[PDB]
Amino acid sequence: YDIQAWKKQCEELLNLIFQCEDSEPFRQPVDLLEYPDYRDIIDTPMDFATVRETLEAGNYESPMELCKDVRLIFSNSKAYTPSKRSRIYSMSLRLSAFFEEHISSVLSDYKSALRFHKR
Ligand SMILES: O=c1cc(Br)ccn1CCO
């Protein structure tokens, strides 16, 4: 029932994601010189360094907010891909599966702890 435990759990999950070769295209903001039309397609860029920095700054109140930003990394990849068979999009799907597998208990434990706090 630790209401704060999600933060270190998210830090550790972000460390695992950074060790994953599949996270390479998503570790830093998409380079607009490499993809000049990116902002014509994507309204809200997101990447894992921005997620880690937001967390470290104390700018996430809950793991649900962090999860919304990580899911935005994957929806941006899906929206920008010219093909469902592209290399970067394919990496995003594996990384998303790994992220969802690991974030589930973090969310469950946090929501359970908050329900206990307000019991
Ligand atoms: O998300 C995508 C998908 C393709 Br295909 C190319 C670039 N980006 C940005 C991350 O590299």
Tab-separated table of N, CA and C and ligand atoms in Angstrom:
chain	number	residue	atom	x	y	z
A	1	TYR	N	0.810	-1.219	0.000
A	1	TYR	CA	0.000	0.000	0.000
A	1	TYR	C	0.849	1.278	0.000
A	2	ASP	N	2.087	1.195	-0.526
A	2	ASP	CA	2.964	2.365	-0.622
A	2	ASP	C	2.530	3.210	-1.824
A	3	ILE	N	1.966	4.400	-1.555
A	3	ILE	CA	1.464	5.329	-2.566
A	3	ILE	C	2.585	5.910	-3.416
A	4	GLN	N	3.841	5.922	-2.919
A	4	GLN	CA	4.962	6.489	-3.671
A	4	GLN	C	5.777	5.477	-4.454
A	5	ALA	N	5.544	4.163	-4.252
A	5	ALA	CA	6.412	3.149	-4.834
A	5	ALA	C	6.483	3.136	-6.341
A	6	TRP	N	5.442	3.617	-7.008
A	6	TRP	CA	5.415	3.621	-8.464
A	6	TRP	C	6.574	4.365	-9.080
A	7	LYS	N	7.106	5.377	-8.397
A	7	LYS	CA	8.120	6.209	-9.028
A	7	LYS	C	9.407	5.457	-9.299
A	8	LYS	N	9.953	4.780	-8.287
A	8	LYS	CA	11.161	3.981	-8.487
A	8	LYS	C	10.865	2.797	-9.419
A	9	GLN	N	9.643	2.225	-9.346
A	9	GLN	CA	9.272	1.129	-10.244
A	9	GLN	C	9.317	1.624	-11.707
A	10	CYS	N	8.854	2.850	-11.940
A	10	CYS	CA	8.905	3.436	-13.286
A	10	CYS	C	10.315	3.765	-13.695
A	11	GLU	N	11.154	4.226	-12.784
A	11	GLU	CA	12.553	4.504	-13.071
A	11	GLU	C	13.256	3.234	-13.517
A	12	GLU	N	12.996	2.115	-12.816
A	12	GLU	CA	13.618	0.850	-13.163
A	12	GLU	C	13.112	0.344	-14.487
A	13	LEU	N	11.800	0.496	-14.755
A	13	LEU	CA	11.255	0.063	-16.044
A	13	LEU	C	11.859	0.905	-17.182
A	14	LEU	N	12.029	2.220	-16.952
A	14	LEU	CA	12.640	3.065	-17.996
A	14	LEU	C	14.084	2.625	-18.233
A	15	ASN	N	14.820	2.222	-17.191
A	15	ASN	CA	16.192	1.713	-17.356
A	15	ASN	C	16.180	0.453	-18.243
A	16	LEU	N	15.232	-0.461	-18.016
A	16	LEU	CA	15.121	-1.665	-18.844
A	16	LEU	C	14.809	-1.296	-20.278
A	17	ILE	N	13.913	-0.317	-20.482
A	17	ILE	CA	13.550	0.110	-21.825
A	17	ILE	C	14.775	0.698	-22.535
A	18	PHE	N	15.567	1.516	-21.837
A	18	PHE	CA	16.778	2.073	-22.443
A	18	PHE	C	17.811	0.980	-22.805
A	19	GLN	N	17.882	-0.129	-22.044
A	19	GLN	CA	18.781	-1.274	-22.371
A	19	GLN	C	18.298	-2.070	-23.602
A	20	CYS	N	16.982	-2.000	-23.904
A	20	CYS	CA	16.352	-2.697	-25.026
A	20	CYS	C	16.801	-2.051	-26.327
A	21	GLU	N	17.296	-2.855	-27.281
A	21	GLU	CA	17.669	-2.315	-28.587
A	21	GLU	C	16.448	-1.743	-29.314
A	22	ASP	N	15.248	-2.302	-29.062
A	22	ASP	CA	14.042	-1.784	-29.694
A	22	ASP	C	13.703	-0.350	-29.304
A	23	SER	N	14.273	0.188	-28.200
A	23	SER	CA	13.949	1.569	-27.838
A	23	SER	C	14.788	2.594	-28.572
A	24	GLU	N	15.810	2.187	-29.346
A	24	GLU	CA	16.710	3.164	-29.953
A	24	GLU	C	16.015	4.293	-30.721
A	25	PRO	N	15.009	4.029	-31.583
A	25	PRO	CA	14.388	5.137	-32.308
A	25	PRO	C	13.591	6.081	-31.427
A	26	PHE	N	13.353	5.712	-30.170
A	26	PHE	CA	12.463	6.440	-29.281
A	26	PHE	C	13.142	7.048	-28.073
A	27	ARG	N	14.461	6.943	-27.975
A	27	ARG	CA	15.196	7.435	-26.815
A	27	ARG	C	15.296	8.933	-26.761
A	28	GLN	N	15.216	9.629	-27.892
A	28	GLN	CA	15.326	11.079	-27.949
A	28	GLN	C	14.247	11.593	-28.907
A	29	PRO	N	13.878	12.897	-28.860
A	29	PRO	CA	12.860	13.398	-29.792
A	29	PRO	C	13.182	13.038	-31.238
A	30	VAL	N	12.150	12.765	-32.041
A	30	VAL	CA	12.339	12.516	-33.476
A	30	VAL	C	13.042	13.733	-34.107
A	31	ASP	N	14.080	13.478	-34.910
A	31	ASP	CA	14.869	14.523	-35.530
A	31	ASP	C	14.118	15.059	-36.742
A	32	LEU	N	13.769	16.326	-36.680
A	32	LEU	CA	13.021	16.962	-37.739
A	32	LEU	C	13.846	17.182	-38.996
A	33	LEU	N	15.189	17.134	-38.911
A	33	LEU	CA	16.009	17.220	-40.114
A	33	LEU	C	15.945	15.885	-40.874
A	34	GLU	N	15.834	14.760	-40.135
A	34	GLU	CA	15.724	13.403	-40.687
A	34	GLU	C	14.308	13.168	-41.253
A	35	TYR	N	13.268	13.741	-40.601
A	35	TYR	CA	11.857	13.529	-40.962
A	35	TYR	C	11.184	14.903	-41.045
A	36	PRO	N	11.411	15.635	-42.148
A	36	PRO	CA	10.957	17.039	-42.199
A	36	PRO	C	9.466	17.299	-42.091
A	37	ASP	N	8.659	16.305	-42.419
A	37	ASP	CA	7.205	16.445	-42.347
A	37	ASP	C	6.629	15.911	-41.025
A	38	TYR	N	7.484	15.556	-40.058
A	38	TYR	CA	6.998	14.929	-38.830
A	38	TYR	C	5.904	15.727	-38.124
A	39	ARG	N	6.113	17.044	-37.933
A	39	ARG	CA	5.120	17.846	-37.224
A	39	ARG	C	3.861	18.144	-38.034
A	40	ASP	N	3.849	17.813	-39.327
A	40	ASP	CA	2.624	17.909	-40.114
A	40	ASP	C	1.664	16.748	-39.758
A	41	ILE	N	2.218	15.625	-39.253
A	41	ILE	CA	1.503	14.395	-38.945
A	41	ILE	C	1.288	14.262	-37.434
A	42	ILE	N	2.315	14.605	-36.645
A	42	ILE	CA	2.330	14.452	-35.190
A	42	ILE	C	2.201	15.750	-34.443
A	43	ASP	N	1.112	15.906	-33.679
A	43	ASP	CA	0.860	17.127	-32.914
A	43	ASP	C	1.650	17.212	-31.627
A	44	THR	N	1.879	16.069	-30.975
A	44	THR	CA	2.550	16.067	-29.680
A	44	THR	C	3.663	15.048	-29.650
A	45	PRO	N	4.876	15.492	-29.966
A	45	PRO	CA	6.003	14.565	-29.928
A	45	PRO	C	6.271	14.088	-28.512
A	46	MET	N	6.728	12.858	-28.418
A	46	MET	CA	7.083	12.288	-27.120
A	46	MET	C	8.179	11.255	-27.308
A	47	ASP	N	9.049	11.124	-26.327
A	47	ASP	CA	10.153	10.180	-26.395
A	47	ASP	C	10.533	9.767	-24.961
A	48	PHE	N	11.356	8.710	-24.814
A	48	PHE	CA	11.678	8.201	-23.482
A	48	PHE	C	12.573	9.077	-22.670
A	49	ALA	N	13.429	9.918	-23.298
A	49	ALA	CA	14.236	10.839	-22.475
A	49	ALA	C	13.334	11.903	-21.871
A	50	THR	N	12.332	12.376	-22.626
A	50	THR	CA	11.385	13.359	-22.088
A	50	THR	C	10.582	12.727	-20.962
A	51	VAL	N	10.182	11.458	-21.115
A	51	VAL	CA	9.436	10.777	-20.019
A	51	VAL	C	10.301	10.677	-18.758
A	52	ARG	N	11.561	10.244	-18.911
A	52	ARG	CA	12.470	10.116	-17.773
A	52	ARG	C	12.723	11.462	-17.104
A	53	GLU	N	12.879	12.519	-17.902
A	53	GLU	CA	13.132	13.847	-17.352
A	53	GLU	C	11.896	14.369	-16.631
A	54	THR	N	10.698	14.107	-17.153
A	54	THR	CA	9.464	14.557	-16.500
A	54	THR	C	9.324	13.862	-15.130
A	55	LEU	N	9.630	12.565	-15.099
A	55	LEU	CA	9.599	11.787	-13.863
A	55	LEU	C	10.617	12.302	-12.867
A	56	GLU	N	11.855	12.508	-13.316
A	56	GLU	CA	12.923	12.968	-12.424
A	56	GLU	C	12.696	14.375	-11.925
A	57	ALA	N	12.037	15.214	-12.706
A	57	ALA	CA	11.690	16.563	-12.280
A	57	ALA	C	10.573	16.595	-11.205
A	58	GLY	N	9.921	15.459	-10.964
A	58	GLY	CA	8.802	15.438	-10.047
A	58	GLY	C	7.592	16.039	-10.717
A	59	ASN	N	7.440	15.825	-12.040
A	59	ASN	CA	6.337	16.394	-12.785
A	59	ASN	C	5.268	15.368	-13.228
A	60	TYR	N	5.340	14.151	-12.685
A	60	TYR	CA	4.265	13.195	-12.838
A	60	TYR	C	3.690	13.020	-11.446
A	61	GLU	N	2.368	13.081	-11.335
A	61	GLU	CA	1.703	12.840	-10.055
A	61	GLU	C	1.397	11.352	-9.858
A	62	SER	N	1.253	10.597	-10.950
A	62	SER	CA	0.840	9.211	-10.863
A	62	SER	C	1.453	8.404	-12.004
A	63	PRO	N	1.502	7.071	-11.884
A	63	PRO	CA	2.006	6.258	-13.006
A	63	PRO	C	1.047	6.283	-14.190
A	64	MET	N	-0.238	6.636	-14.001
A	64	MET	CA	-1.159	6.754	-15.123
A	64	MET	C	-0.712	7.880	-16.044
A	65	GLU	N	-0.183	8.980	-15.484
A	65	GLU	CA	0.263	10.080	-16.346
A	65	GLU	C	1.487	9.655	-17.130
A	66	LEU	N	2.433	8.930	-16.488
A	66	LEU	CA	3.624	8.446	-17.198
A	66	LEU	C	3.204	7.484	-18.311
A	67	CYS	N	2.262	6.582	-18.010
A	67	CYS	CA	1.756	5.597	-18.964
A	67	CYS	C	1.125	6.311	-20.175
A	68	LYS	N	0.382	7.407	-19.963
A	68	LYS	CA	-0.220	8.158	-21.070
A	68	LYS	C	0.855	8.703	-22.011
A	69	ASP	N	1.963	9.221	-21.440
A	69	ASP	CA	3.061	9.715	-22.292
A	69	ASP	C	3.778	8.576	-23.011
A	70	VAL	N	3.998	7.414	-22.346
A	70	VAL	CA	4.675	6.309	-23.027
A	70	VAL	C	3.789	5.794	-24.166
A	71	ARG	N	2.478	5.723	-23.937
A	71	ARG	CA	1.551	5.265	-24.966
A	71	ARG	C	1.502	6.236	-26.127
A	72	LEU	N	1.762	7.526	-25.884
A	72	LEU	CA	1.835	8.546	-26.931
A	72	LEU	C	3.055	8.296	-27.802
A	73	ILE	N	4.176	7.824	-27.226
A	73	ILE	CA	5.363	7.467	-28.043
A	73	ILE	C	4.948	6.416	-29.089
A	74	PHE	N	4.178	5.419	-28.644
A	74	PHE	CA	3.783	4.348	-29.550
A	74	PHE	C	2.709	4.776	-30.517
A	75	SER	N	1.720	5.589	-30.085
A	75	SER	CA	0.707	6.038	-31.037
A	75	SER	C	1.329	6.972	-32.062
A	76	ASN	N	2.340	7.788	-31.693
A	76	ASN	CA	3.012	8.640	-32.686
A	76	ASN	C	3.703	7.777	-33.719
A	77	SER	N	4.362	6.700	-33.288
A	77	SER	CA	5.026	5.813	-34.251
A	77	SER	C	4.014	5.184	-35.208
A	78	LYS	N	2.871	4.764	-34.676
A	78	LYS	CA	1.824	4.162	-35.500
A	78	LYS	C	1.243	5.160	-36.499
A	79	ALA	N	1.098	6.411	-36.080
A	79	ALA	CA	0.536	7.439	-36.951
A	79	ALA	C	1.552	7.865	-38.012
A	80	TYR	N	2.851	7.889	-37.684
A	80	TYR	CA	3.845	8.382	-38.645
A	80	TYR	C	4.311	7.321	-39.618
A	81	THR	N	4.180	6.033	-39.262
A	81	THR	CA	4.695	4.985	-40.118
A	81	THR	C	3.996	4.966	-41.479
A	82	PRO	N	4.764	4.825	-42.569
A	82	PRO	CA	4.120	4.714	-43.887
A	82	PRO	C	3.602	3.285	-44.125
A	83	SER	N	4.037	2.324	-43.290
A	83	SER	CA	3.652	0.944	-43.443
A	83	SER	C	3.587	0.233	-42.100
A	84	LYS	N	2.656	-0.731	-41.968
A	84	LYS	CA	2.621	-1.521	-40.733
A	84	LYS	C	3.804	-2.507	-40.649
A	85	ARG	N	4.578	-2.652	-41.734
A	85	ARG	CA	5.739	-3.520	-41.760
A	85	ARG	C	7.042	-2.747	-41.652
A	86	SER	N	7.009	-1.426	-41.374
A	86	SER	CA	8.238	-0.662	-41.289
A	86	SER	C	9.083	-1.086	-40.111
A	87	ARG	N	10.402	-0.897	-40.200
A	87	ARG	CA	11.303	-1.310	-39.126
A	87	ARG	C	10.992	-0.591	-37.819
A	88	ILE	N	10.927	0.730	-37.841
A	88	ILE	CA	10.721	1.487	-36.584
A	88	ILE	C	9.385	1.177	-35.950
A	89	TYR	N	8.321	1.094	-36.736
A	89	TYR	CA	6.997	0.745	-36.196
A	89	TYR	C	7.022	-0.656	-35.618
A	90	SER	N	7.695	-1.595	-36.290
A	90	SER	CA	7.773	-2.966	-35.775
A	90	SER	C	8.483	-3.012	-34.428
A	91	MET	N	9.505	-2.170	-34.252
A	91	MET	CA	10.228	-2.085	-32.981
A	91	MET	C	9.287	-1.503	-31.906
A	92	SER	N	8.465	-0.511	-32.293
A	92	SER	CA	7.515	0.100	-31.375
A	92	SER	C	6.526	-0.927	-30.860
A	93	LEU	N	6.065	-1.883	-31.694
A	93	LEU	CA	5.089	-2.865	-31.235
A	93	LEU	C	5.679	-3.822	-30.223
A	94	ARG	N	6.939	-4.246	-30.429
A	94	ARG	CA	7.566	-5.137	-29.451
A	94	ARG	C	7.812	-4.394	-28.158
A	95	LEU	N	8.293	-3.153	-28.263
A	95	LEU	CA	8.579	-2.378	-27.061
A	95	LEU	C	7.299	-2.082	-26.281
A	96	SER	N	6.196	-1.832	-27.009
A	96	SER	CA	4.911	-1.566	-26.378
A	96	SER	C	4.441	-2.807	-25.613
A	97	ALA	N	4.602	-4.000	-26.204
A	97	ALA	CA	4.211	-5.231	-25.525
A	97	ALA	C	5.015	-5.412	-24.244
A	98	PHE	N	6.320	-5.131	-24.305
A	98	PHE	CA	7.201	-5.248	-23.133
A	98	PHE	C	6.784	-4.227	-22.057
A	99	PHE	N	6.526	-2.986	-22.485
A	99	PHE	CA	6.095	-1.946	-21.560
A	99	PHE	C	4.766	-2.323	-20.890
A	100	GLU	N	3.764	-2.747	-21.676
A	100	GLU	CA	2.447	-3.062	-21.104
A	100	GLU	C	2.538	-4.218	-20.123
A	101	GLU	N	3.378	-5.205	-20.432
A	101	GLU	CA	3.579	-6.368	-19.570
A	101	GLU	C	4.111	-5.953	-18.201
A	102	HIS	N	4.996	-4.958	-18.173
A	102	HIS	CA	5.645	-4.509	-16.956
A	102	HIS	C	4.907	-3.405	-16.217
A	103	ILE	N	4.174	-2.543	-16.923
A	103	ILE	CA	3.467	-1.440	-16.259
A	103	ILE	C	2.189	-1.860	-15.557
A	104	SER	N	1.607	-2.988	-15.952
A	104	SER	CA	0.358	-3.470	-15.379
A	104	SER	C	0.380	-3.568	-13.854
A	105	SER	N	1.402	-4.219	-13.270
A	105	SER	CA	1.477	-4.328	-11.807
A	105	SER	C	1.735	-2.979	-11.159
A	106	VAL	N	2.516	-2.099	-11.808
A	106	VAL	CA	2.764	-0.761	-11.260
A	106	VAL	C	1.451	0.019	-11.102
A	107	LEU	N	0.611	-0.020	-12.138
A	107	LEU	CA	-0.680	0.652	-12.101
A	107	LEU	C	-1.583	0.024	-11.090
A	108	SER	N	-1.656	-1.311	-11.080
A	108	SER	CA	-2.523	-2.018	-10.139
A	108	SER	C	-2.151	-1.731	-8.706
A	109	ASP	N	-0.850	-1.788	-8.383
A	109	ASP	CA	-0.395	-1.540	-7.014
A	109	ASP	C	-0.682	-0.120	-6.607
A	110	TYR	N	-0.426	0.851	-7.503
A	110	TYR	CA	-0.716	2.242	-7.162
A	110	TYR	C	-2.200	2.475	-6.905
A	111	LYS	N	-3.071	1.984	-7.794
A	111	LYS	CA	-4.501	2.185	-7.611
A	111	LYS	C	-4.995	1.502	-6.349
A	112	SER	N	-4.460	0.323	-6.046
A	112	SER	CA	-4.816	-0.384	-4.807
A	112	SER	C	-4.371	0.417	-3.571
A	113	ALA	N	-3.155	0.983	-3.618
A	113	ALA	CA	-2.626	1.774	-2.496
A	113	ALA	C	-3.460	3.009	-2.280
A	114	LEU	N	-3.901	3.678	-3.348
A	114	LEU	CA	-4.718	4.873	-3.202
A	114	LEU	C	-6.079	4.531	-2.653
A	115	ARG	N	-6.663	3.385	-3.073
A	115	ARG	CA	-7.948	2.952	-2.524
A	115	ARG	C	-7.782	2.673	-1.029
A	116	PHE	N	-6.652	2.054	-0.633
A	116	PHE	CA	-6.397	1.793	0.788
A	116	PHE	C	-6.263	3.093	1.554
A	117	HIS	N	-5.586	4.071	0.965
A	117	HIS	CA	-5.407	5.368	1.628
A	117	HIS	C	-6.734	6.077	1.896
A	118	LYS	N	-7.667	5.963	0.959
A	118	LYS	CA	-8.961	6.617	1.079
A	118	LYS	C	-10.055	5.736	1.667
A	119	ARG	N	-9.726	4.515	2.154
A	119	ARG	CA	-10.699	3.569	2.712
A	119	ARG	C	-11.536	4.162	3.853
B	1	LIG	O1	7.909	6.693	-35.513
B	1	LIG	C1	8.513	6.642	-36.575
B	1	LIG	C2	8.206	5.721	-37.680
B	1	LIG	C3	8.975	5.780	-38.792
B	1	LIG	BR1	8.769	4.474	-40.211
B	1	LIG	C4	10.020	6.714	-38.976
B	1	LIG	C5	10.321	7.578	-37.967
B	1	LIG	N1	9.615	7.534	-36.777
B	1	LIG	C6	10.085	8.343	-35.656
B	1	LIG	C7	10.956	7.477	-34.701
B	1	LIG	O2	12.103	7.080	-35.381
